[PDB]
A paper describes a structure:
GNAT toxins acetylate the α-amino group of the aminoacyl-moiety of aminoacyl-tRNAs, using acetyl CoA (Ac-CoA) as the acetyl group donor, and inhibit cellular translation.
Since Ac–Met–tRNAfMet is chemically more stable than Met–tRNAfMet, Ac–Met–tRNAfMet was used instead of Met–tRNAfMet for crystallization. The crystal belongs to the space group P21212 and contains eight AtaT molecules and two Ac–Met–tRNAfMet molecules in the asymmetric unit. The structure was model-built and refined to an R factor of 28.6% (Rfree = 34.1%) at 3.8 Å resolution. In the structure of AtaT complexed with Ac–Met–tRNAfMet, two tRNAfMet molecules (tRNAfMeta and tRNAfMetb) interact with an AtaT homodimer (AtaTa and AtaTb). The 3′-terminal single-stranded region and acceptor stem of each tRNAfMet interact with the positively charged interface between the two subunits of the AtaT dimer. As a result, C1–A72 at the top of the acceptor helix of tRNAfMet are completely separated and the 5′-terminal C1 nucleoside is flipped. Residues S76, K77, S78, and K79 in α3 of AtaTb interact with the phosphate backbones of C67C68C69, at the bottom half of the acceptor helix. The 3′-C75A76–Ac–Met region of Ac–Met–tRNAfMet was disordered and not visible in the present structure.
Author numbering:
A (entry chain G), B (entry chain G): 5 to 172
Amino acid sequence: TIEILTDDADYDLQRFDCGEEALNLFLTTHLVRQHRNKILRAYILCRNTPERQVLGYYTLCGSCFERAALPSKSKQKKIPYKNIPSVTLGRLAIDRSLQGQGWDATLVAHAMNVVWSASLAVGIHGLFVEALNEKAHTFYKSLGFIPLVGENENALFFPTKSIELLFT
Amino acid sequence: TIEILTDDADYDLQRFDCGEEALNLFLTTHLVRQHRNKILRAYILCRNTPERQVLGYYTLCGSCFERAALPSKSKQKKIPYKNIPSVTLGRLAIDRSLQGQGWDATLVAHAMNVVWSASLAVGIHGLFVEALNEKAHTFYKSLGFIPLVGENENALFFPTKSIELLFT
RNA sequence: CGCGGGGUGGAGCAGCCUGGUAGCUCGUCGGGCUCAUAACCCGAAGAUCGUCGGUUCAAAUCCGGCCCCCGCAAC
RNA sequence: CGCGGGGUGGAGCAGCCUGGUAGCUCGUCGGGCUCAUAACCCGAAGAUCGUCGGUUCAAAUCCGGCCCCCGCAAC
């Protein structure tokens, strides 16, 4: 099952290793208080085992971006404010032992489900992500992430309405 | 009871009248698609009557602000990003017939409860509000809203931890 | 769904209304005729009709979802 | 809770460790003495110990939550 971090963590963190080093450091170093200080929410894809074998995680932090980053002025005439409510997908990683099996997209989908249940609360438009990787940018575009073109040139977006349609 | 807008609205909107005109226009004019386009979420304080007597409402839109707006550099050393996850309390109003009875604060508290349940999802820090009214700024400071001093000089803030402590 | 219009060679228009059919003016190029040409005559290429779906033996055409562009009232 | 220090007249320090007590140097001002003064002698004011709580007959002092400030490693 997929689950958020409990109050008592009791996770095994060192034997985990995703692809990129920077994300390993983000896991080992910055995540603890950022979760406890309610900077972001971390969701964990684990085996539900006693060892809590760590194989995936993702981070969600609400955010804003310049409205001009939208590609279509038609969508701009729909939003009456200079800033756009967004949720930044801060980081997303799966252990290397499972890469090439689509669990990346499964995590993105669970995150979209959570963002949908959240849209019931503060009604933001979808998922913002600033993908440094080129593979990540193309991988997101494969799932249909809208490229945001503005002062930022590396972000991809996913609308709330597409999330509604995905869950029928 | 307090409730969000259903799919079928069936509300009585004209006989409602809050204090400020601008908010009346925001209600009559911009709210419909902003709810339907998932720009924000509107919560309604109604009598649960057949007429759906409208006496209060508030709007929530996730947002960001410059980190330098925080008053204490101590809290700045806690947040490792230039932008801070926030939820903007876009608008808040109660019908004039009930002003001076504290339902303003009751709505703020229900909104805080919702932001708490949301903090379980994207872990933002609390409530951002840009209060044009001076009465509103002082009224928020009475409930303990932290004034944000930065490029913006009119916003007030409420942390997530205070919300946790309020609900015991 | 704020009101309304619109989607097609490279550009700009008609083809609908009325299901079966790719048309017109520029532009490109080829050819013919001229001392010669952006001028005159002839010819060729490029759009599969914004995308997706439905009905139909068949769809640019009728119907629905969505996308995009333009003007205006509001921000 | 990244590591560590710190909170007190207007500024900078000690008072803890050891519960009962407001102290020192500047600064302000008043007075005395000088041709006179920031110089010498005397005196006064201003902090209720960051905030909140707990224990105690009693708290700056012990204990807890929180707030704020400084340095450094990281961003």
